[PDB]
Enzyme design. Structure first.
Site, short mmCIF file in Angstrom:
data_model
loop_
_atom_site.label_atom_id
_atom_site.label_comp_id
_atom_site.label_asym_id
_atom_site.label_seq_id
_atom_site.Cartn_x
_atom_site.Cartn_y
_atom_site.Cartn_z
N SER A 61 -6.22 3.06 4.08
CA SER A 61 -5.73 2.10 3.13
C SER A 61 -6.31 1.20 2.19
CB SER A 61 -4.83 1.30 3.04
OG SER A 61 -3.38 0.81 2.31
N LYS A 76 0.18 4.14 -2.95
CA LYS A 76 -1.21 4.92 -2.76
C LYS A 76 -0.48 6.58 -2.65
CE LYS A 76 -4.71 1.46 -1.13
NZ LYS A 76 -4.20 0.20 -0.55
N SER A 120 0.74 -1.04 0.09
CA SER A 120 -0.61 0.18 0.18
C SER A 120 0.96 1.41 0.06
CB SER A 120 -0.96 -0.43 1.29
OG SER A 120 -1.92 -0.83 1.02
C1 LIG Z 1 -1.95 -2.81 1.38
O1 LIG Z 1 -1.21 -2.98 1.04
C2 LIG Z 1 -3.03 -2.76 1.31
N1 LIG Z 1 -2.75 -4.39 1.50
C3 LIG Z 1 -3.49 -5.54 1.02
O2 LIG Z 1 -4.22 -5.65 0.43
C4 LIG Z 1 -2.78 -6.63 1.67
C5 LIG Z 1 -2.62 -7.33 0.81
C6 LIG Z 1 -2.99 -8.91 0.92
C7 LIG Z 1 -3.02 -9.82 -0.53
C8 LIG Z 1 -2.69 -11.57 -0.25
N2 LIG Z 1 -2.95 -12.50 -1.17
C9 LIG Z 1 -1.45 -12.34 0.50
O3 LIG Z 1 -0.59 -11.92 -0.46
O4 LIG Z 1 -0.95 -12.06 1.68
C10 LIG Z 1 -4.19 -2.48 2.77
N3 LIG Z 1 -3.25 -1.73 3.86
C11 LIG Z 1 -3.43 -2.31 4.42
C12 LIG Z 1 -2.66 -1.71 5.52
O5 LIG Z 1 -2.51 -1.97 7.27
O6 LIG Z 1 -2.02 -0.60 5.23
C13 LIG Z 1 -4.64 -3.19 5.01
C14 LIG Z 1 -4.78 -3.40 6.37
C15 LIG Z 1 -5.91 -4.49 4.65
S1 LIG Z 1 -5.48 -2.97 2.90
#
Ligand SMILES: *C(=O)[C@@H](NC(=O)CCCC[C@@H](N)C(=O)O)[C@@H]1N=C(C(=O)O)C(=C)CS1
Ligand SMILES: [Mg+2]
Length: 466
Positions: A298, A52, A49
């Site tokens: 996020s 972003k 993330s």
């Molecule tokens: C950003 O990093 C985004 N994260 C995700 O989408 C997690 C990806 C999980 C994918 C699986 N396939 C894996 O490989 O493990 C959002 N970010 C946060 C954050 O803490 O910044 C979240 C709480 C979840 S969504």
């Protein structure tokens, strides 16, 4: 006083939690331009993330902090003395924060404007963006979960955080041995239900699984829920977000006195229509507002939807292919060197994205002096802040440390990938940092990240609140 800082970051990065991890770590004084610390600063790493950061900055350059988003309702001509129309169109143009309440306010208008019967069909028009729902390399097994929701120009957003393209499922126990009771939430009447879940004796073990099997629109619940358990809730994604927007709309219409009798589905305004009568419409809050729920929590859908919005703005095309070139261009226009960058989506979900830690910090100082600096920094989570809409994904980190209330940073975690990057404002100078971790076996190294961020706050002349 500067070798002590370095020696400590060097020791912190020695943690066994970073066994076999490449880590990119860069620290820079935003005032002087001085590079306080740098390790593997030019290594190409997965951002999760932290990507972003790049999207958010480009949406502010291209769309502006002033940008809002529209939805509307259209028929071929106004209603008449009998109060009838033919087909009706719900038309979405990229609003990432359209609630069920917004749908209800638009149904009242459709009624307040003289309608009493939709005699033809209700259509959901999401043609402002293309119908590529998921990025090429996202993982199929992830598709049930809110972060992996499908991407549309017309989507219904749930709760105060505005999770798009989902419904809330709730599972309530009955008596021992009777089936559990499953709610589909908004997707009631839209999504199929395969409920196989049972109620177990009180105090037994909860073995409940909630799923949407790949390439269905079925919510499948298996397992036991104990008779004395608290009821369980889960956000699950639906197939075709816009189709659910349509379903929710005819209920709203039906609720406001308008009696829809055709079926419901997707379709665009015919174009052999000359003067479409607009019977209702909505406008979202401005992008400076929308940047708060987006960046603190996020939200992935927001990021993708802002990408396809950028592609409409620069190129007349609501597409990843186009909006990603839009993001890269906006970044360049800003002063950022993008050689290190590979851009495959806006949210960071995709493992085909690459940044370098040097690039992040370039952006940080570039976005620092941009006209919109304060709206950009107000959307970043602040360390240690209890309130979900100030603290975001950092509310429960670094409390009671020099970094509480002070450090503004973006997060991002997947399997094998974690990052923290942001600002440390102090008397001893305004610092900019990026920690990107790749390749570790255990949990994400959140404590190593917190640890560095705290050392930096101490460096900038801070002390722990007591
Ligand atoms: C950003 O990093 C985004 N994260 C995700 O989408 C997690 C990806 C999980 C994918 C699986 N396939 C894996 O490989 O493990 C959002 N970010 C946060 C954050 O803490 O910044 C979240 C709480 C979840 S969504
Ligand atoms: Mg302080």
């Amino acid at each position: 006083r500067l070798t002590e800082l370095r020696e400590d970051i060097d020791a912190i990065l020695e943690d066994p939690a970073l066994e076999g991890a490449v880590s990119g770590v860069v620290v820079v004084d935003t005032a002087t331009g001085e590079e306080l610390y740098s390790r593997d600063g030019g290594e190409q790493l997965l951002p999760a993330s932290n990507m972003k950061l790049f999207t958010a900055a480009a949406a502010l350059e291209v769309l502006g902090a002033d940008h809002s988003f529209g939805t509307e309702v259209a028929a071929e001509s106004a209603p008449g003395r009998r109060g009838e129309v033919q087909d009706l169109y719900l038309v979405g143009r990229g609003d990432p924060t359209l609630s069920a309440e917004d749908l209800d306010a638009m149904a009242a208008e459709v009624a307040a404007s003289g309608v009493r019967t939709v005699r033809g069909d209700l259509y959901a028009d999401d043609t402002w963006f293309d119908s590529e729902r998921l990025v090429d390399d996202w993982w199929p097994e992830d598709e049930p979960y809110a972060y992996s929701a499908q991407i549309s120009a017309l989507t219904v957003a749930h709760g105060e955080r505005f999770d798009t393209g989902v419904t809330e499922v709730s599972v309530t126990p009955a008596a021992e041995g009777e089936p559990a009771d499953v709610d589909l939430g908004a997707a009631e009447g839209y999504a199929e239900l395969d409920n196989r879940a049972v109620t177990g004796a009180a105090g037994s073990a909860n073995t409940l699984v909630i799923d949407r099997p790949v390439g269905t629109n079925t919510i499948a619940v298996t397992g036991s829920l104990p008779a004395d358990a608290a009821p369980v809730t889960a956000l699950r994604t639906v197939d075709e977000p816009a189709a659910l927007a349509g379903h929710l709309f005819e209920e709203a219409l039906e609720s406001n006195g308008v009696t829809v009798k055709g079926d419901v589905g997707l379709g665009g305004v015919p174009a052999d229509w000359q003067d479409a009568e607009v019977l209702a419409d909505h406008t979202s809050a401005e992008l400076s507002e929308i940047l708060v729920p987006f960046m603190k929590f996020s939200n992935n859908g927001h990021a993708e939807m802002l990408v396809k919005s950028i592609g409409q703005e620069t190129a007349g095309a609501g597409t990843w292919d186009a909006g990603l070139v839009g993001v890269e261009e906006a970044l360049s226009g800003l002063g950022v060197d993008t050689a290190g960058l590979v851009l495959n989506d806006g949210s960071g979900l995709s493992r085909g994205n690459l940044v370098t830690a040097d690039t992040v910090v370039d952006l940080l100082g570039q976005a620092g002096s941009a006209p919109w600096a304060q709206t950009w920094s107000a959307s970043l989570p602040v360390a240690g802040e209890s309130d979900p809409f100030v603290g975001g994904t950092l509310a429960n980190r670094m409390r009671g440390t020099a970094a509480e209330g002070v450090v503004e940073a973006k997060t991002g975690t997947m399997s094998g990938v974690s990052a923290l990057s942001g600002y440390v404002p102090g008397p001893e100078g305004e610092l900019a940092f990026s920690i990107v971790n790749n390749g570790h076996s255990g949990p994400a190294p959140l404590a190593v990240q917190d640890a560095i961020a705290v050392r930096l706050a101490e460096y900038a002349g801070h002390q722990a609140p007591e």
